[PDB]
Swiss-Prot record, chains A, B, C, D, E, F:
Disulfide bridge partners, by residue number: none
Role according to the record: Neuronal protein that plays several roles in synaptic activity such as regulation of synaptic vesicle trafficking and subsequent neurotransmitter release. Participates as a monomer in synaptic vesicle exocytosis by enhancing vesicle priming, fusion and dilation of exocytotic fusion pores. Mechanistically, acts by increasing local Ca(2+) release from microdomains which is essential for the enhancement of ATP-induced exocytosis.
The protein, known as: Alpha-synuclein
GO biological process: adult locomotory behavior; amyloid fibril formation; behavioral response to cocaine; cellular response to copper ion; cellular response to epinephrine stimulus; cellular response to fibroblast growth factor stimulus; cellular response to oxidative stress; chemical synaptic transmission
Gene: SNCA
Annotated family: Belongs to the synuclein family.
Region (4 X 11 AA tandem repeats of [EGS]-K-T-K-[EQ]-[GQ]-V-X(4)): 1-32
Binding site for Cu cation: H15
Keyword Repeat: yes
Localization (cell): Cytoplasm; Membrane; Nucleus; Synapse
Native source organism of the sequence: Homo sapiens
Record note on domains: The 'non A-beta component of Alzheimer disease amyloid plaque' domain (NAC domain) is involved in fibrils formation. The middle hydrophobic region forms the core of the filaments. The C-terminus may regulate aggregation and determine the diameter of the filaments.
Oligomer and partners: Soluble monomer. Homotetramer. A dynamic intracellular population of tetramers and monomers coexists normally and the tetramer plays an essential role in maintaining homeostasis. Interacts with UCHL1. Interacts with phospholipase D and histones. Interacts (via N-terminus) with synphilin-1/SNCAIP; this interaction promotes formation of SNCA inclusions in the cytoplasm. Interacts with CALM1. Interacts with STXBP1; this interaction controls SNCA self-replicating aggregation. Interacts with SNARE components VAMP2 and SNAP25; these interactions allows SNARE complex assembly and integrity.
Full-sequence range covered: 36 to 97 of 140
Amino acid sequence: GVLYVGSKTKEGVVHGVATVAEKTKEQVTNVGGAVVTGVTAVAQKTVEGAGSIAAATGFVKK
Amino acid sequence: GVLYVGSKTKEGVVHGVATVAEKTKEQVTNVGGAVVTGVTAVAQKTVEGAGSIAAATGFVKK
Amino acid sequence: GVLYVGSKTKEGVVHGVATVAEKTKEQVTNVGGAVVTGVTAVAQKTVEGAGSIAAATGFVKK
Amino acid sequence: GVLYVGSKTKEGVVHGVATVAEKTKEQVTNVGGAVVTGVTAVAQKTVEGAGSIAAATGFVKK
Amino acid sequence: GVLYVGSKTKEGVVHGVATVAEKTKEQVTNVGGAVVTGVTAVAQKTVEGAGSIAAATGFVKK
Amino acid sequence: GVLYVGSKTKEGVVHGVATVAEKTKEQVTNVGGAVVTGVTAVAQKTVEGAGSIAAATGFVKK
């Protein structure tokens, strides 16, 4: 398999993840896993086999 | 298999994920998994085999 | 397998992850895992085999 | 004459003058005169007598 | 004449004059005259008599 | 004449004049005259008599 990526750009601005939170009490931000950000972002074969990517969060309150 | 991607652009602006929350109490933001953001974003063969990507969250309150 | 990435750009600005939180009490930020940020961001074969990437957080309050 | 001004406020945000210009060639911004901006802005007896406030601009092109 | 100004505020943000210009060639910014900016901005008797405030600009091109 | 100004504030932020210019060739910024900026900004009797405040700029191109 052959994968060819050609990018010819001018004045590129990229904003991957932006989270804004205010006037709360409990704030939990969980950013992770496989995040690719940029002008030429390529993600090939992220997981192979029995692998796993969780990027999980849990909230428990009593 | 052959995959050809050709991008010729000028003045490109990309905003992948933007979350805004205010005037709450409990705020849980879970951003993850396989997120590709950018001017030339290519995602080929993200999962192969018995793999898995969760990117899961859970809220429990009593 | 052959993977070719060619980037020819001018005046590129990339913002990967930006989190803003204010006027709260409890704030937990967990950024990790496999985060690739930049003008030419390539992520190939992040996980191979029985590996795993958690990037997980948990909130417990009684 | 008696002038009474009483302001009791919380979390006040004031934006007086905001000018945005882009993708032009000739841009002339003239901001002046008697501009009062703020949470408690009072303007009493700006001009008295034969006075004058111009705050004027002129564009000539041949 | 009696002028009473009473300001009782909390967390005040004031932006008087904001000018943004881009992707032009000729840019002339003229900010002046009588500009009062702030949380408690009072302007009383700016001009008295035969006085004058110009705050003027002129563009000539041949 | 009696002028009373009373300011009782907490966490005050003031931005008087902000000019941003980019991607131009000719840029002329003229800020002056009578500019009062601050948390408690008072401007009384700026001009008296036959006085004048210009704060003027001129652009000539052939």
